[PDB]
Design a protein around this ligand. Structure first.
Ligand code: CLA
Ligand code: CLA
Ligand code: CLA
Ligand code: CLA
Ligand code: CLA
Ligand code: CLA
Ligand code: CLA
Ligand code: CLA
Ligand code: CLA
Ligand SMILES: CCCCCCCCCCCCCCCC(=O)OC[C@H](COP(=O)(O)OC[C@@H](O)CO)OC(=O)CCCCCCCCCCCCCCC
Lengths: 84, 150, 160, 41, 141, 742, 80
């Protein structure tokens, strides 16, 4: 509604609309369990490496397989034109 | 000229034969005294006349059974290309020469564009027959053929 | 004389407009309570919730529409794919953060409240917080997949 | 009406010209059909 | 001469539009155009649809400037009005843009000094090769 | 106020202005300096509000123009009836409609064209027509060539009257602006007078000429033996032996107690098992309801007797919390702007033509129309294009209104407002829906193609794998089946045979109609329709809403409705104009309609049309391959295009070789359009510079300086040939296919 | 931003200044023509490059030219 140079932020609608600002609704201890067990993945960089190397090799690992399609299998191959 | 004259081509004869049988087949449904029948019999007579002329005018034929044209300049086939062509260049030259006679007549005048969208038919009719002797454009070429400014 | 449709926050020269789907008390309450908007909570904390919900949910589509089941015994293995997608996603988030925010920098969210209550500094949106959020998103994502899968083993649900 | 003559000789001059040409060409063909060559020399 | 300054002046009556300011205004720049109206009148908004001018001084904030001139130009003709527009920035500094030199740009003013004028007019510029490798450009000369 | 007839005396009539090209415009009446002048002359010829600013003059121009249009339509109808009299086998077709091909154009024997006069039956040589006129004429009880000849004269006379009226109402007695604006009047008349009396009138010819004569034709009596229509009016005995209700006069109507008239009027519904067309007894009855309905409807609006409605009153009283004072001021806008009216009318008339096509195929109205697949495929496709074009035209004039007539200070609306005040919300959402529809319709196909090619048929979206059964349309379909007797007790048979279930109708050895199946194949194509339609809507609505202003161009309205751009600045602003949105929308309408008529052609041949013998065995034209092969793009390329295009590419030497010529001919002009669409006038103008040099050299350079086409015209030329080429190709392809196979 | 130049070929008609949508040009005193004025591009930072100026010049060859250069937010005509 307003317009003051004093407060441009407010002038140009920089409002944290749907922001809560409320205290944490999460039960403690639960938070602390998650705060100590998910801590290694919060460092960045290292998470990036853990996901690349980890995701890469984990993917490689499923290299091994059976009922994917590794079986041309006992089927008499055609010739099938002038031949070859 | 690896071809054989049409007069003595079997394939050329097979085409005339096959074509006439196709038109005659249609002849059956219409009975005799009839409009379509007369129309089809007229196409048949027009068909025979066509093939007859091609053979008559010594046109070679290809293994396909269709005439082919010689444009090399060979004297036996000027009818095939050269004779009609000269005829063309005469007319083309005529049209162009008359068209250029009009623009020059129009150029030094009032609003020149006015007579380019609305034709001066008296002037055009005056200039149309000048194309008859358009190859005396050559004698304009000895002097005022084309502009010197460019 | 009463119109329902009004300019945003009373300012007609700013982008948005106010409609029942934007500024309803139900919509406001619901959106203010999502984990994302709890500005005052640990980013890491907020994330895990998003991961858990999202993870859990992703198992369904992969398993049911997957090449492996569709009458093919592979079954619940799909869930494993879902566990793969939360890895891809985590990667993206980590990237978004790294690129966006710098270490030294401060938050970029908006400090003014809708009502002008300058009183509020906020969020993750900092290199430190975002890393926490993604890091928590992952943990939650994997755990979400696992528990859905865990339910799959026990079975009983009508769809699968 | 001078003016009517003026409507004419516009692009109606093209159609009157080409219609005459088309007619002439058609009659020639009706008279001399299927000509692939000039055989008079 | 010094430019006018502002600002606490009211803004026109409008209902809200989607063409309004965005994040760019918050973090890059935004513009303000101001004018004096003799009557309370209705005008077409560049961003939106229709707004009501308020009699007396009027203030409007628009993004992009061109929007400012488009509206302002409309203000000059249509109705007779005198307008001015400034560039806001986000810190709070403001910058007077138009007119900027007393008078409008169409009208020649003595205060003004030329910028970017080449006295060797024509397309007498040199071939690109001539400046090749010289940071220069042919027109810049 | 009181409504009356208002006119003015003579306002000039001379050939003087014929002699002056571009007289209507002050800019262009000075003559040409460049060749651009010529194109502008034809492009601004019908832009009346661009000629003058007086609303009275513009209104008088468009009024006589409509007379000119009607004159042509009457002259056009005069020819079709004439050709059905001199150059047709209608009398032959009238005896054996199920075997003889309808033809109404003979070709002169010059240059070899006589081959196009093929075996159409009845001992007649000509071109098979797909207009459908034979089935109209038989339905009207038209027996001889004399009657078609009389109608030819009648239409020609009317054509003269229409043409005379236009001159009379522009040059002699020109209606005043107040006269045109009496909309409460006009709607009353067009509702009651044109539509009510019009439908009433035709209900009469049917129950005196059509119904009596058609019964004779169906009994099997020779058409030449059947008494003339006027023998039914004079001697009521003839019209009493059949339809005995005529024994009484106005009773029972006058004494009410309706009716013993159930004899020649009924709610039977379905299809005549002998003619394959809708029961004439139902159609006559249908026009009876339509007459009265429109006669009733023609008394809503108040005129000169205080009873009725002020449209201005109705609108203003329709305002809600969500919309403001909206609807207020719409009456003044719609009575002041021609473009505003034309946009609504095009949108609605265009939409009507589309429902006509879908209604005439599924409920065959004329006798022996259903089993003439050549006509039905043509009629459906024809109306789809006509409707399709008119809708795009609505967008153009909606945009023109925004640019030219829109004024908030004078004629505010509030409803039109607000829309402009959140135009980004509408376009951004319509943007999203299209992307969702694209993926969820077309993406399913690409999925199907890839799975099939990888040899995974069970991983496809099909009836035999992952099914997408369109259950909502199926449930409805079933509901119309159980409609007669249950829901509508008065209805004896179903509304359409596509809802029949276990009912089939055949005429000759060919199938007229049967219940049309719906499966996953039908699901996919309909979302493709839903997809293509939205994108067309997106392009056109974006053009209208952002016609005046934009974050990119604050003052776009000043640049006009039809301008090339605003330069390469701001990254480039080509095709920002509303005109260019219509131009872009044209291609997408083409895209949408083309897949619609392909949806029709394949579905009918595959699941509906075909041969039936007297054992019940039905053999469809393409043999029911729609369900398993239309669900794949390769399937459309192979089993539809490649397979069915064989007739048109094997038509040389046949009577259908003209279609073979138009097939290639249309491919040509289509590709030709791409030269204009992929290039710019900058190149062409420079090329013309070198060519102009050569003419100057030989002193043959024209005063009218040659110029390359304008940026806009280059687009106009391009989309015109793209449309002509593409549409004409399918035309030649369709007709050759359906005439040879059908 | 874009580059815009003027040339002594200018006749002081002033049309471009009237044509510009972003107030880039203006007129300044000069003595090379009867109008005694010449265009100037003192604010090329606000130019968009639509060339409405060029489209309005009557000199045989444009006396005002716009050479599209490095792109900025201002030149890209972005309201966001
Ligand atoms: C017969 C005598 C006659 C004469 C001398 C005039 C003379 C005039 N008329 Mg009138 N007019 C007439 C009959 C006549 N008109 C009739 C019968 C109608 C009813 C349709 C009209 C309706 C009419 C309107 C609405 C207007 C005029 C106007 C004018 C003036 C403009 C001159 C002009 O360029 O016209 C045009 C010359 C032409 C040759 C146009 C031909 C258009 C025809 C109908 C095309 C037919 C369609 C065609 C078959 C499409 C197929 C194309 C395809 C084959 C390629 C001029 C004084 C205009 C005016 O007042 O100036 C501002 C004006 O607005 N006339
Ligand atoms: C490829 C280049 C080429 C060119 C430019 C020509 C040109 C010509 N040929 Mg030749 N020809 C060619 C290749 C070519 N030929 C080849 C590869 C063969 C192998 C068969 C021949 C076999 C051939 C024969 C048998 C004859 C010609 C003749 C001619 C002349 C006929 C025109 C005329 O009568 O005068 C102009 C007439 C008017 C202007 C009127 C013309 C000069 C004819 C000739 O010799 O002319 C008398 C002729 O008899 N040509
Ligand atoms: C209305 C239908 C119609 C009919 C029945 C005819 C009939 C005829 N035309 Mg005409 N023609 C018509 C329409 C028609 N034409 C139209 C619409 C045009 C274009 C305007 C022409 C242009 C035309 C031309 C240029 C010629 C004819 C000629 C002829 C005659 C052939 C003379 C001859 O002996 O052959 C053989 C002639 C030899 C030299 C061998 C024939 C009587 C010919 C004629 O008689 O000249 C006056 C002629 O050359 N016609
Ligand atoms: C309105 C649409 C329309 C169209 C597309 C046609 C088209 C045609 N007509 Mg029809 N005609 C029409 C209306 C129409 N006509 C009306 C309203 C009448 C009643 C007066 C006629 C009376 C008529 C007759 C008597 C004949 C035709 C003929 C023809 C064909 C010969 C082309 C031609 O005229 O030669 C060239 C054009 C000229 C010489 C003048 C220009 C052509 C298919 C002819 C035909 O069918 O051939 C056997 C023919 O005999 N027409
Ligand atoms: C109730 C009587 C009546 C009837 C039948 C019509 C019919 C028509 N009007 Mg008119 N109109 C009427 C009253 C009527 N109007 C009144 C009172 C006003 C003043 C408000 C108008 C103002 C008006 C305008 C501005 C226009 C029309 C137009 C039309 C035509 C629309 C196109 C069409 O359907 O082609 C079908 C053709 C026919 C059905 C042939 C009918 C020919 C006459 C009317 C037969 C009457 C004979 C009668 C028994 C004696 C149509 C002929 C449009 C038009 O096309 O202009 C030419 C047009 O622009 N009308
Ligand atoms: C389209 C408008 C229309 C017109 C101009 C007519 C005109 C006529 N009707 Mg028809 N009629 C119509 C619609 C129309 N009708 C409709 C829609 C129905 C069905 C409800 C009828 C049912 C009907 C019957 C049962 C009879 C007529 C009869 C007549 C004739 C009157 C003779 C008499 O006085 O009766 C005495 C007259 C030619 C009478 C007749 O056929 O003439 C002997 C007569 O018996 N009409
Ligand atoms: C009720 C129908 C209707 C009416 C009365 C109008 C009327 C008008 N239109 Mg609209 N329009 C319509 C439908 C209609 N239109 C539809 C359905 C579309 C979608 C395509 C459009 C799209 C459209 C655009 C984009 C524009 C108009 C414009 C105009 C105005 C001037 C047009 C002009 O001068 O004619 C001139 C006529 C020609 C130049 C004829 C050109 C020939 C066409 C392009 C090809 C025809 C080929 C033919 C079908 C088959 C090929 C035969 C060939 C081989 C000989 C005029 C008010 C213009 C305007 O600015 O409004 C003020 C404008 O730019 N219209
Ligand atoms: C065949 C060529 C073609 C294609 C594929 C498109 C596609 C599209 N058009 Mg364009 N259009 C075309 C020709 C084409 N058009 C031509 C010739 C013109 C000139 C008139 C236009 C004019 C035009 C306009 C004016 C508009 C469009 C719009 C659109 C979009 C509609 C929304 C949508 O469906 O989202 C879905 C996208 C698709 C269906 C594309 C296929 C996606 C594949 C099948 C799946 C993805 C593949 C894979 C998973 C990706 C990863 C691969 C990896 C290796 C990179 C869509 C992207 C509208 C728009 O912008 O959208 C709102 C818009 O307004 N078109
Ligand atoms: C919601 C879907 C639906 C639709 C589209 C229809 C449509 C129709 N119904 Mg059905 N109806 C429905 C649901 C529906 N009905 C249900 C759920 C029931 C109860 C089971 C009925 C019971 C019903 C009866 C008893 C009749 C209809 C009739 C009709 C037809 C004429 C209606 C009318 O007002 O004319 C105007 C009617 C009058 C002016 C006279 C008033 C007396 C009415 C007929 C009672 C019309 C096709 C009539 C019919 O059979 O048409 C041939 C009829 O008699 N309906
Ligand atoms: C089957 C195709 C439709 C698919 C449904 C989803 C498409 C929705 C597209 C438009 C949604 C935007 C609605 C807000 C537009 C809006 O606010 O309209 C205003 C209207 C409120 O009516 P008012 O009280 O303003 O009515 C008074 C005046 O509008 C009439 O004189 O709300 C609705 O239309 C409810 C119906 C919406 C559903 C339409 C279908």
């Amino acid at each position: 509604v307003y317009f003051d140079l004093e407060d441009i932020g407010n002038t140009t609608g920089q409002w944290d609309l749907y922001g809560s600002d409320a205290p944490s609704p999460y039960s403690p201890l639960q938070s602390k369990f998650f705060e100590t067990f998910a801590a290694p993945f919060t460092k960045r960089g290292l998470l990036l490496k853990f996901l690349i190397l980890g995701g890469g090799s984990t993917l490689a690992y499923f290299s091994t397989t059976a009922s994917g399609d590794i079986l041309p299998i006992v089927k008499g191959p055609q010739l099938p034109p002038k031949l070859g | 000229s690896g071809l054989t004259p049409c007069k003595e081509s079997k394939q050329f004869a097979k085409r005339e034969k096959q074509s006439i049988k196709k038109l005659e087949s249609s002849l059956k449904i219409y009975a005799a005294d009839s409009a379509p029948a007369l129309a089809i019999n007229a196409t048949i007579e027009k068909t025979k006349r066509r093939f007859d002329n091609y053979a008559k005018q010594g046109l070679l034929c290809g293994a396909d059974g269709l005439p082919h044209l010689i444009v090399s300049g060979d004297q036996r086939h000027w009818g095939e290309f050269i004779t009609p062509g000269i005829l063309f260049l005469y007319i083309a030259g005529w049209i162009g020469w008359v068209g250029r006679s009009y623009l020059i007549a129009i150029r030094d005048e009032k609003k020149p564009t006015q007579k380019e969208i609305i034709i001066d038919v008296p002037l055009a009719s005056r200039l149309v027959f000048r194309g008859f002797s358009w190859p005396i454009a050559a004698y304009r070429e000895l002097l005022n053929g084309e502009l010197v400014a460019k | 004389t009463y119109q329902v449709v009004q300019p945003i926050n009373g300012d007609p020269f700013i982008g948005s407009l106010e409609t029942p789907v934007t500024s309803s008390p139900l919509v406001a309450w619901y959106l203010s309570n999502l984990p994302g908007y709890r500005t005052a909570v640990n980013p890491l904390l907020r994330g895990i919730e998003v991961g858990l919900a999202h993870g859990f949910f992703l198992v369904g589509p992969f398993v049911k529409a997957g090449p492996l089941r569709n009458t093919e015994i592979a079954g619940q293995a799909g869930s494993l794919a879902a566990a793969g997608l939360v890895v891809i996603l985590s990667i993206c988030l980590t990237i978004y953060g790294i690129s966006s925010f710098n270490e030294g920098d401060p938050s970029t969210a908006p400090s003014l409240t809708l009502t002008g209550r300058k009183k509020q500094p906020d969020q993750l949106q900092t290199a430190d917080g975002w890393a926490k959020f993604t890091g928590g998103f992952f943990f939650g994502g994997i755990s979400g997949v696992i528990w859905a899968f865990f339910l799959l083993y026990v079975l009983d649900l009508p769809y699968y | 009406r001078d003016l009517k003559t003026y409507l004419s000789v516009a692009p109606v001059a093209s159609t009157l010209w080409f219609a005459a040409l088309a007619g002439l060409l058609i009659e020639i063909n009706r008279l001399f059909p299927d000509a692939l060559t000039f055989p008079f020399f | 001469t010094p430019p006018e300054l502002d600002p606490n002046t009211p803004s026109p009556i409008f209902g809200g539009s989607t063409g309004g300011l965005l994040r760019k205004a918050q973090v890059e720049e935004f513009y303000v155009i101001t004018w004096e109206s003799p009557k309370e009148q209705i005008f077409e908004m560049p961003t939106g649809g229709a707004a009501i001018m308020r009699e007396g001084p009027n203030l409007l904030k628009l993004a992009r400037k061109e929007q400012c001139l488009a509206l302002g130009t409309r203000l000059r003709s249509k109705y007779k009005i005198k307008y001015q527009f400034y560039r806001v920035f986000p810190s709070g500094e403001v910058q007077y843009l138009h007119p900027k030199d007393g008078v409008y740009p169409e009208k020649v003013n003595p205060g003004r000094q030329g910028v970017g004028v080449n006295f060797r007019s024509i397309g007498k510029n040199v071939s690109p090769i001539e400046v090749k490798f010289t940071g220069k450009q042919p027109y810049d000369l | 106020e009181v409504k009356i007839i208002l006119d003015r005396d003579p306002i000039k009539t001379s050939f003087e202005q014929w002699a002056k090209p571009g007289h209507f415009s002050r800019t262009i009446a000075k003559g040409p300096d460049t060749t651009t002048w010529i194109w502008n002359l034809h492009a601004d010829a019908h832009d009346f509000d661009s000629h003058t600013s007086d609303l009275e003059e513009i209104s008088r121009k468009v009024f006589s123009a409509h007379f000119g249009q009607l004159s042509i339509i009457f002259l056009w109808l005069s020819g079709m009836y004439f050709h059905g009299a001199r150059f047709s086998n209608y009398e032959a077709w009238l005896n054996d409609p199920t075997h003889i091909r309808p033809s109404a154009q003979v070709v002169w024997p010059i240059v070899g064209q006589e081959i196009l006069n093929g075996d159409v039956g009845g001992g007649f040589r000509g071109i098979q027509i797909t207009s459908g006129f034979f089935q109209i004429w038989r339905a009207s009880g038209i027996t001889s060539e004399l009657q078609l000849y009389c109608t030819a004269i009648g239409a020609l006379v009317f054509a003269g009257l229409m043409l005379f009226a236009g001159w009379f109402h522009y040059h002699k007695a020109a209606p005043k602006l107040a006269w045109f604006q009496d909309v409460e009047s006009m709607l009353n008349h067009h509702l009651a007078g044109l539509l009510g009396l019009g439908s009433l009138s035709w209900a009469g010819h049917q129950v005196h000429v059509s119904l009596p004569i058609n019964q004779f034709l169906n009994a099997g009596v020779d058409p030449k033996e059947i008494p003339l229509p006027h023998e039914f009016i004079l001697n009521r005995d003839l019209l009493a032996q059949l339809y005995p209700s005529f024994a009484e006069g106005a009773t029972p109507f006058f004494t009410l107690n309706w009716s013993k008239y159930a004899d020649f009027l009924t709610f039977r519904g379905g299809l005549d098992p002998l003619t394959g067309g809708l029961w004439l007894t139902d159609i006559a009855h249908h026009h009876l309801a339509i007459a009265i309905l429109f006669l009733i409807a023609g008394h809503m609006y108040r005129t000169n007797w205080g009873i009725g409605h002020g449209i201005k009153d109705i609108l203003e009283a329709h305002k809600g919390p969500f919309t403001g004072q909206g609807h207020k001021g719409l009456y003044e806008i719609l009575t002041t702007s021609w473009h505003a009216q034309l946009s609504i009318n095009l949108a609605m008339l265009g939409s009507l033509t589309i429902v006509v096509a879908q209604h005439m195929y599924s409920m065959p109205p004329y006798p022996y129309l259903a089993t003439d697949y050549a006509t039905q495929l043509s009629l459906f496709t024809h109306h789809m294009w006509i409707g399709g074009f008119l809708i795009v035209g609505a967008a153009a004039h909606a945009a023109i209104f925004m640019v030219r007539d829109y004024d908030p200070t004078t004629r505010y609306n509030d409803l039109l407002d607000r829309v402009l005040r959140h135009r980004d919300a509408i376009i951004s959402h319509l943007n999203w829906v299209c992307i969702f529809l694209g993926f969820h319709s077309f993406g399913l196909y690409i999925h199907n193609d890839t799975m099939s090619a990888l040899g995974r048929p069970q991983d496809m979206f099909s009836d035999t794998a992952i099914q997408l059964q369109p259950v909502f349309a199926q449930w409805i379909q079933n509901t119309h089946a159980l409609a007669p007797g249950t829901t509508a007790p008065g209805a004896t048979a179903s509304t359409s045979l596509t809802w029949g279930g276990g009912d089939l109708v055949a005429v000759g050895n060919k199938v007229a109609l049967l219940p049309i199946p719906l499966g996953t194949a039908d699901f996919l194509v309909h979302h493709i329709h839903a997809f293509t339609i939205h994108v067309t809507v997106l392009i056109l609505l974006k053009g209208v809403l952002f016609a005046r202003s934009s974050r990119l161009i604050p003052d776009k309205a000043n640049l006009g409705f039809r301008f090339p751009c605003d330069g390469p600045g701001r990254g480039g602003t080509c095709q920002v104009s509303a005109w260019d949105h219509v131009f872009l929308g044209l291609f997408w309408m083409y895209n949408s309609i083309s897949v619609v008529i392909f949806h029709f052609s394949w579905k009918m041949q595959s699941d509906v049309w075909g041969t039936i013998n007297d054992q019940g065995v039905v053999t469809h034209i393409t043999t029911g391959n729609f369900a398993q092969s239309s669900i794949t793009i390769n399937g459309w390329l192979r089993d539809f295009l490649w397979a069915q295009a064989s007739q048109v590419i094997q038509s040389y030497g046949s009577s259908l070789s003209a279609y073979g010529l138009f097939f290639l001919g249309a491919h040509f002009v289509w590709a030709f359009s791409l030269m204009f669409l992929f290039s710019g006038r900058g190149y062409w103008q420079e090329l013309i510079e070198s060519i102009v040099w050569a003419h100057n050299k030989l002193k043959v350079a024209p005063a009218t300086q040659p110029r390359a086409l304008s940026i806009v015209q280059g687009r106009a030329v391009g989309v015109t040939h793209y449309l002509l080429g593409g549409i004409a190709t399918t035309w030649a392809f369709f007709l050759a296919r359906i005439i040879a196979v059908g | 931003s874009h580059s815009v130049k003027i040339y002594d070929t200018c006749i002081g008609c002033t049309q471009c200044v009237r044509a510009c949508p972003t107030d880039v040009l203006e007129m300044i005193p000069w003595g090379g023509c009867k109008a005694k004025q010449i265009a100037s591009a003192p604010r090329t930072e606000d130019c968009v490059g639509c060339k409405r100026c060029e489209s309005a010049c009557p000199t045989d060859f444009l006396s005002v030219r716009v050479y599209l250069w490095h792109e900025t937010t201002r030149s890209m005509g972005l309201a966001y």
